[PDB]
Amino acid sequence: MRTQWPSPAKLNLFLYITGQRADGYHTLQTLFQFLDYGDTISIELRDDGDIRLLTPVEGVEHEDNLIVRAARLLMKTAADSGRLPTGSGANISIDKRLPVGGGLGGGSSNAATVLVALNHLWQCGLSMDELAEMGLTLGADVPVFVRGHAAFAEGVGEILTPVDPPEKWYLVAHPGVSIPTPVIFKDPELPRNTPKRSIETLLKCEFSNDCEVIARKRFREVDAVLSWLLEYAPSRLTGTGACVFAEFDTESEARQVLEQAPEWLNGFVAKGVNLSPLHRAML
């Protein structure tokens, strides 16, 4: 039997950088919402203990792939606590719609979907807390996807308070440039002093992304996409870019703007989701 599992994108609806820890990571205040749009991961169980990703992700080696790393990490954690039925393995395939890189979190979502699916399929019985703890070792974005709810995130992104932001419609655009996440976070001029504020304050304040000014300055393609969208709707960088999104109250308006968009915006339209499609599938 094959099972299929959603791997949704996320948006950072706002993002404030509040400081930096000694190990390099930044402490932030951000608001995660899923999109009802993303990759689909298909899994067929194996009985020989092997883990095989059958569909390569462009530019990613098999053992570097967050899909394989998640699966191996669950297998090692489960086997070390006696929670791995003998012979547990998997064949994994992905229909990948999310850009590799871009701020939509596709790789982290892939890892989270694999952790959740294989925990169920192999019957490891790991708790949400346990999966999120292992997920954090694969990326600071992974716990929000594991836990499955829109959330106000503090710390480095793993301190998650569920909130239900309005589920807007979004035109998500991908500028034609790859921005490595470390470039933004290493920039001397990145805000790392935005005051830490309460969720009420942040919900009433206009949403912004502290990384946007640097992404726009350093990558002309991002500035171009943001300038175009800003004529139609509130629009912002998500993550550290390059992806930008525009927010609409209705599906109709979002799709009309996308119809007008030059092809170099590389756009799609999707609705916000406060419950992850992964967790809606798990019901």
Q: Catalytic residues, which ones? A: 10, 141
Q: How many residues bind ligand ADP (CB under 6 A)?
A: 19
Residues 127 and 124: their CA atoms lie apart, in Å, by 9
Strand 267-273 versus strand 169-173 pairing type: antiparallel
Using alpha carbons, list the distances in angstroms from residue 127 to 7, 90, 131, 232: 19, 21, 6, 44
Tell me the residue nearest to ligand ADP as measured from the CB.
Answer: 107
Q: Are 92 and 74 in contact (CB under 8 A)?
A: no
Sequence letter at residue 201: T
Among 9, 11, 28, 74, binds ligand QBI (CB under 6 A): 28
Among 13, 15, 66, 150, binds ligand ADP (CB under 6 A): 66
Q: Which residues contact 96 (CB under 8 A, 6 or more apart)?
A: 39, 55, 57, 106
Among 6, 8, 157, 239, binds ligand ADP (CB under 6 A): 239
Q: Does 28 bind ligand ADP (CB under 6 A)?
A: no
Among 53, 112, 140, 229, binds ligand QBI (CB under 6 A): 140
Segment contacting ligand QBI (CB under 6 A): 115-123, 153-161, 196-204, 264-272?
153-161
Q: What are phi and psi of 125, to 5 degrees?
A: 65, 25
Of 105-144, which residues contact ligand ADP (CB under 6 A)?
105-108, 110
Strand 267-273 versus strand 26-46 pairing type: antiparallel
Residues 238 and 178: their CA atoms lie apart, in Å, by 14
Among 101, 102, 107, 239, binds ligand QBI (CB under 6 A): 239
Q: Are 265 and 280 in contact (CB under 8 A)?
A: no
DSSP classification of residue 275:
B
66 binds, among ligand QBI, ligand ADP, none (CB under 5 to 8 A by kind): ligand ADP
Q: What are phi and psi of 244, to 5 degrees?
A: -125, 150
Segment contacting ligand QBI (CB under 6 A): 23-31, 84-92, 187-195, 252-260?
23-31
Cα dihedral 182, 185, 187, 193, rounded to 10, equals -170
Give the nearer residue to ligand QBI in terms of CB position, either 124 or 237.
237
Q: What are phi and psi of 112, to 5 degrees?
A: -65, -45
Q: Does 215 bind ligand ADP (CB under 6 A)?
A: no
Q: Does 100 bind ligand ADP (CB under 6 A)?
A: yes
Give least dist CB 137 to ligand ADP, A.
14
Give the nearer residue to ligand ADP in terms of CB position, either 83 or 210.
210
Q: Does 18 bind ligand QBI (CB under 6 A)?
A: no
Q: Using CB under 6 A as the criterion, which residues of the chain lie in contact with ligand QBI when the complex forms? A: 12, 15, 24-26, 28, 30, 140-141, 153, 156-157, 181, 185, 239-240
